[PDB]
């Protein structure tokens, strides 16, 4: 207030100059071909899975690859938060004919996920547990009702012909001891584990943020 206020005016000038140039520089880098952190061979989809025409995705995948998806990872928005019925109504029966589903599940939605795998034609055969690690290397114990939750369970179901050329058996680990990188941000190691399961295959992520965009992945999301 009073004199220092216009002093702040000089301040609100100076910063608004400097940041301006910074923004310009970034946009200039945008003009002269700046690569983003997402890979080139990533297939992003920006649509709600309630309103997304999955038949278009199926036809495009048939005419571009000749085969359905080999791994379908999923980090559902458990109760934007989709209901259990709307998550279940997703046509995963037609998105996969012979392969794996890698659906993440919080504890409160652990059982219904086993239902969904059962209701999508999959048979539940695996679980991969991500033990959250602190920066120092300790166990990132959270909050629970019966036990201190320090884990995230990704249930893996399988559907059909697996003994073909793809789908290498007896690989990776069922435990990911990785650090917490963000809010509901899954570890990167599972992707590597997926590449350990199915080398150079076609994969789908149904609820994917911009950090889940990988090579040879058809990711779906609303903030993509």
């Amino acid at each position: 207030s009073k004199k220092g206020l216009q002093g702040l005016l000089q301040d609100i000038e100076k910063r608004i100059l400097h940041y301006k140039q910074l923004f310009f520089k970034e946009q200039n880098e945008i003009a002269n071909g700046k690569r983003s952190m997402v890979p080139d061979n990533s297939i992003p989809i920006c649509s709600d899975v309630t309103k997304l025409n999955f038949q278009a995705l199926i036809d495009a995948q048939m005419r571009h690859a000749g085969k359905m998806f080999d791994v379908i990872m999923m980090d559902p928005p458990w109760q934007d938060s989709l209901s259990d019925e709307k998550i279940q109504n997703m046509p995963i029966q037609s998105l996969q004919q012979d392969g794996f589903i890698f659906v993440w599940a919080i504890n409160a939605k652990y059982r219904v996920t086993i239902k969904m795998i059962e209701n999508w034609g999959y048979k539940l055969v695996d679980e991969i547990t991500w033990v959250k690690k602190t920066v120092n290397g300790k166990i990132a114990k959270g909050h629970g009702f019966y036990l201190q939750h320090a884990k995230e369970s990704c249930l893996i179901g399988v559907k059909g012909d697996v003994d073909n050329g793809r789908f290498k058996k007896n690989i990776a680990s069922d435990v990911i001891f990785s650090e917490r990188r963000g809010q509901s941000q899954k570890p990167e190691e599972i992707y590597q584990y997926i590449n350990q399961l199915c080398p150079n295959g076609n994969y789908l992520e149904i609820f994917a943020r911009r950090n889940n965009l990988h090579d040879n992945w058809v990711s779906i999301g609303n903030e993509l």
């Binding site: 504890n107 539940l124 114990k141 201190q148 893996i156 007896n170």
Partner: protein, 262 residues
């Protein structure tokens, strides 16, 4: 660096509880032919914790005797045996969901899973340096525990016990915990968040599913911490409120009903 003096700290703190005599009132050792086809309501009532020490016959456990999953549906858990309480099951990866489905047919909602990361005993020994009897296995477990300040340099991902499995290597054991709410206004008192949902154990490669002593004690202490009033203290407690199926024939834990398949 791997903080295994803190991950495996419990192996230096928890002591195995001494087994109580069969002729003592602090245990109820019952012997049955088949636990899955035995009326357990005659061997305890008003239970709060039912820890089924189930060793399953699964394809991952190669040529090893164990319980068949399809017989678990024959088990009877009436409301007289357990009205409002928690049931603990050792779960294998190929019969996980089936167990849950079976537990849904007997009024047991899934509430938790308690997972044991397995650290390879041979891997830890090789990191220290560079059929096995259970006494020897315990000896090298204690040796690994003593020599843990020089094992901290090895990355934790090279110590995980990645055992054979058709899809993903088995470096985990699971204890699924289910609840039966039963009647209303009958509150089951629980001391919450007093045990980590994840634990780390140095195990042998041959039978990771068969949890050894000092770690079954961890499960026992988890159960006794989760259900405080289920602990049997003499004087004002008429009956035992804990009961374990397929218990050890020599270790009868006080405060529990020891059901032995004989």
């Amino acid at each position: 660096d791997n903080q295994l003096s803190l991950l495996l700290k419990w192996r230096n703190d928890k002591i195995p509880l001494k087994s109580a005599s069969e002729t003592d009132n602090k245990c109820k050792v019952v012997n049955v032919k088949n636990i899955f086809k035995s009326d357990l309501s005659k061997y305890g009532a008003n239970l709060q914790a039912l820890f089924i020490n189930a060793l399953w016959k699964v394809k991952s456990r190669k040529e090893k005797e164990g319980l068949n999953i399809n017989d678990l549906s024959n088990l009877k858990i009436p409301l007289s045996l357990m009205k409002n309480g928690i049931l603990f099951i050792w779960s294998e990866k190929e019969i996980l969901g089936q167990i849950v489905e079976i537990m849904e047919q007997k009024g047991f909602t899934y509430i938790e899973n308690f997972s044991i990361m397995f650290l390879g005993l041979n891997k830890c020994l090789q990191s220290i340096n560079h059929e096995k009897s259970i006494e020897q296995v315990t000896q090298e477990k204690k040796f690994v525990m003593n020599n843990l300040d020089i094992l901290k340099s090895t990355d934790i991902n090279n110590l995980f016990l990645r055992n054979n499995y058709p899809y993903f290597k088995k470096t985990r054991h699971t204890l699924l915990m289910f609840r039966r709410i039963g009647d209303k206004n009958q509150k089951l008192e629980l001391r919450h968040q007093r045990t980590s949902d994840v634990v780390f154990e140095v195990t042998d490669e041959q039978d990771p599913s068969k949890v050894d002593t000092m770690m079954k004690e961890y499960v026992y202490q988890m159960i006794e911490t989760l259900l405080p009033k289920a602990q049997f203290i003499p004087g004002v407690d008429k009956h035992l409120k804990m009961m374990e199926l397929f218990a050890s024939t020599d270790n009868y834990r006080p405060g529990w009903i020891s059901v032995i398949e004989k």
